[PDB]
């Protein structure tokens, strides 16, 4: 009778699996659906800089967010080098293009790599001790060898980021916003997001977001960096929608490998003064924030329920037949 | 013989499932592939505004599309508040930062939240009846309490959006454009997209796109909003490519919850006048259009066909054995 | 005994499949994970243009990359038409809006499609032989009928694109950059990517990228185009991370169908001169580069290993029972 006792145990273990795991845990009675998301970001916070060339400079949201309209990926400026009042003309090329001593060491034209301008074939003086090729281009050339340290916009640590995420589960016609029912105006007036204390506030302090990605804002501010923000919507639509909540994770890794460690870009502000076209060239160091929204909604459906029941019946039958096979041999 | 009759029915029902559903409907004879897509958008249409501060202002595509080069996510401006000729200096801070009565009610420095400038510790007059902290910043401060109603660019309803979607099924080396063979120059000259009448015209009226997402353009224009546009490519590559067509759906939900209901951003136009740097500050209300392109191409392949045949043979055999088991007990 | 010999062969063939394919090839012992990616791009290279209206014009990275901060999708300008010093006023509308002969042929207001301005009801002269509606708008109207050929920025072929891709496998806590251990500073100083010679250099020549997508840079430069760049991370995390490498593919199809073949957009540079607001209107033809990053990391896990073992046991048992069934009938 011991073989018969084993038969029953195996039959029940199989039934316990088929129900508890496949039907209940894995939710085999549910049809699944992905989402389509929209993310809007608003930055708040102010930075002031005191350069030697200029006076106090105010940096508000319109000036330190790239793009201004926002996106899933956006940059907050944390440092910059500015080359003001650049004009198109002839100047000494930056020594990174090459250092010459005579006019014969310059070839007219463009460098094969990282050309700064059209070489005129003339070796002119970059400074009092270095002579470089004369070029036609934006003059004076940018000198970005000294990255400002501490970062010019290191006050961006206290900037607040408001993420407005609108998601739709199109199959189930369910619309959710990360501004969930628990979020009200009083919360939006004072709340700052906290992984455990305030996991639903959609206003994030930038320094907290960088800290939670495992990075140091002081290091990321000087040369730039990347913080990934994931918003996950794992919703069981058999329950009320008020349980369909977003989960926030922050990702990032800054290493001292010193091979392109940070993030920077160059942009220019063009203007006309005294009838001549000028530009301000900025090398902008900043943290790029990538906001990735994924999710999965499940709702009970009859067709998955029957299909799962059929699969469980098949699993149960195969098990019984193989056990009758194994016992025949034993 | 009734048991034998049932045996045959169950055997055939199983065969009917294995062929008709798994092989034919679910297309188990096909290998599947996702796509890689590119979306370009061109807006057309003009808006004119008549502000009290300025004269008639023309708003063409270069000015109301953010970004100008386009993207999967782009904003069309439908309303704005403009603060012209802002300069960096000292002014009264906006009363939203706090209302003071004496110089002692102001602390020099920055507010912890939503700082507008560097407080100087002086309580100056915002208007004839309100006194606020004096700040260093962009002056005069923006006053965006009165959103223009009706929307300044409510004529954007008649703007036309041209979506050019290029998709590739890299596994099958198949390239498709949403400008399908049925779309010609004569169509692009006059066609407007219609869910049923013109489901292939790639020129969309903005108001129609908002209406089809379930929203009201008049409401979305004043404070902004979001419309999701999905392009789906469900193509059976056993047929001619001319049947590989895109399907357009429009998604969106505007609610009167009054907690961040619309969409807005701030951007600045910088300029130099009389040797002093100025900026025009715009608070731009607009509809963000997210274009999501997904799809799936199937082509007959021999390996899925054999694997499906093996799976069907297994299903048929398991069924017969379990039926011989059930009949043994019956 | 021949039937018994077949039984064993089928049993072993089944075991060979269950191990070699399912366990070893398909890696059924591994748990899988997707990635979250961040892409930053830096363009380098210079172009000079010699228009008849202006002098030599220098085009560096800040001016020919849209957006300047970069994105997954970005545009490199390869051609442009410029309408300088546009002001809001009254001018002759472009003849594409319609050609009139009398003032009665113009209706005040806006065109239903592709409106260029507010018609005043007056038929004025566009040129010495064409009369069009007078409009209020940006004047003079852009004339983009003659696309510059050869392309004004056809030197963009030699521009170099640096892709910095940071990916994370969040389930396995593995961070990878496309600047893999084999890439050093000496490589970044001189390397250009090559499908087979230098498959790991993250600096791409634009012309090479277009050639590898199957397109001609000369054709794409005049009217614009699209090149898709895919970065794939198919990593087996049972091995060292130094084997987690990116694979680059380039996608694109340019056809002479002449129905919206290229890519272009319009953007404006606004400025103030002599107390009047002006703008430079650019119609920018360029190649849009879409960078798509996908990947899959597998690491050995005990739960998939046991589940695969159970599936293989089930497959083996079903096979033996059906073979005993087939042999009973034979
Ligand atoms: C004139 O221009 C040249 C070139 O820009 C200047 O020389 C450069 O000066 C910087 C700062 O001292 C040097 O950077 C440092 O170099 C050492 C190695 O020598 C390195 O250990 C440091 O980490 C740092 O990178 C740079 O190498 C040097 N370049 C050359 C070609 O010597 C020069 O100082 C300028 N003169 C004046 C009057 O400003
Ligand atoms: C000087 O500045 C102050 C502050 O901006 C102005 O007071 C504000 O005026 C607006 C318009 O009347 C008020 O908005 C309305 O408030 C009521 C509640 O009182 C609300 O029901 C309406 O929906 C609307 O929001 C605003 O509350 C009020 N602020 C304060 C602090 O009283 C004032 O009118 C300005 N004076 C001049 C001469 O313009
Ligand atoms: C004044 O303006 C009108 C309208 O812009 C100019 O007429 C246009 O001239 C262009 C160039 O010759 C024509 O383009 C060509 O048309 C032929 C067909 O006629 C076509 O085969 C070519 O591929 C090309 O597209 C354009 O059709 C023509 N438009 C009209 C309405 O006739 C005119 O030349 C201008 N006059 C001066 C003095 O510049
Ligand atoms: N598109 C490109 N083509 C060639 N070299 C590039 C390109 N982008 C970056 N580099 C080079 O790669 C190295 C590291 O890149 P990175 O941009 O992070 O440093 P960087 O100092 O900010 O670069 P740079 O000052 O030259 O813009 C630099 O020496 C830079 O010149
Ligand atoms: N990054 C942020 N940090 C703190 N508060 C924010 C942030 N973004 C928005 N808010 C606040 O959230 C509330 C609602 O946001 P929303 O931007 O939709 O309204 P708003 O009136 O346009 O905001 P505002 O005028 O202050 O830019 C506003 O009171 C706004 O001040
Ligand atoms: N949003 C839109 N609404 C209506 N027509 C459009 C729109 N976008 C493009 N078109 C028209 O489609 C045709 C082909 O589009 P495409 O932009 O590629 O050519 P184009 O010459 O650059 O267009 P255009 O010069 O008018 O901007 C053009 O005649 C253009 O006028
Ligand atoms: C960001 O904000 C915090 C909080 O206001 C600042 O921390 C303060 O620093 C000053 C100067 O050291 C101290 O006197 C305060 O006591 C600190 N406050 C707290 C609560 O710790 C911080 O300096 C700010 N920094 C930046 C870069 O913006
Ligand atoms: C968008 O276009 C439609 C169609 O031209 C405009 O509807 C017209 O409105 C005027 C004024 O009420 C009527 O005289 C016309 O008969 C309407 N035409 C049609 C076909 O209904 C509409 O006003 C425009 N609105 C915006 C905001 O652009
Ligand atoms: C891009 O760079 C290549 C390489 O420098 C250029 O090819 C050169 O063209 C000139 C003029 O015909 C020849 O004298 C050189 O011998 C060529 N070099 C090589 C290695 O082939 C090319 O012209 C450049 N073009 C653009 C559009 O930038
Ligand atoms: C960042 O690094 C500096 C040293 O470079 C250290 O003093 C500081 O405390 C760090 N900040 C954090 C948040 O760890
Ligand atoms: C939008 O709402 C207004 C009332 O606020 C209504 O008069 C108008 O008809 C609505 N438009 C549409 C398209 O339903
Ligand atoms: C591009 O096309 C032109 C002809 O239009 C041809 O001369 C040239 O060689 C082509 N370039 C490449 C890279 O094939
Ligand atoms: Mg540098
Ligand atoms: Mg406000
Ligand atoms: Mg045109």
Residue numbers in the entry:
A (entry chain C), B (entry chain A), C (entry chain B): 27 to 356
Task: Copy the relevant paper text.
P2X receptors are a family of seven trimeric non-selective cation channels that are activated by extracellular ATP to play roles in the cardiovascular, neuronal, and immune systems. Like other P2XR subtypes, hP2X1 exhibits a trimeric architecture. Each protomer, described to resemble a breaching dolphin, is composed of a large, hydrophilic extracellular domain (ECD), two transmembrane (TM) spanning alpha helices (the outer TM1 and pore-lining TM2), and intracellular N- and C- termini. Here we report high-resolution cryo-EM structures of the human P2X1 receptor in the apo closed, ATP-bound desensitized, and the high-affinity antagonist NF449-bound inhibited states.
The cryo-EM structure of hP2X1 in the ATP-bound desensitized state at 2.4 Å resolution provides insight into the pore architecture of the desensitized state conformation and reveals subtype-specific interactions in the P2X1 receptor’s orthosteric ATP-binding site. This structure is defined as the desensitized state conformation because ATP is bound in the orthosteric pocket and the pore is uniquely closed. The ATP-bound desensitized state conformation was isolated following purification of hP2X1 without the addition of exogenous ATP, as endogenous ATP released during cell lysis binds to the receptor and remains bound throughout the purification process and structural analysis. However, the result is the same, as the movements in the TMD induce an inward rotation of residue V344 on TM2 of hP2X1 (residue V334 on TM2 of hP2X3) to block the pore and form the constriction gate for the ATP-bound desensitized state. The position of the closed gate in hP2X1 is now 16 Å deep into the plasma membrane, as measured from the beginning of the TM2 helix (residue I328). With the gate deeper into the bilayer and both TMs rotated downward, the TMD architecture of hP2X1 in the ATP-bound desensitized state now resembles a “cone”. In the ATP-bound desensitized state of hP2X1, ATP is coordinated by seven interactions that are conserved amongst all P2XRs: N290, T186, R292, K68, K70, K190, and K309. In the analogous position to P128 in hP2X3, K140 in hP2X1 directly contacts the 2’-hydroxyl on the ribose ring of ATP (2.6 Å). In the ATP-bound desensitized state structure of hP2X1, there is significant density for a metal ion, which is coordinated by the sidechain of D170 (distances of 2.6 Å and 2.9 Å for oxygens on the carboxylic acid sidechain) and to the γ-phosphate of ATP (2.2 Å). Given the coordination, the known modulatory role of Mg2+ on P2X1 function, and the known interactions between Mg2+ and ATP, we chose to model the ion as a Mg2+ and validated it using the CheckMyMetal online server, where Mg2+ appears to be a plausible choice.
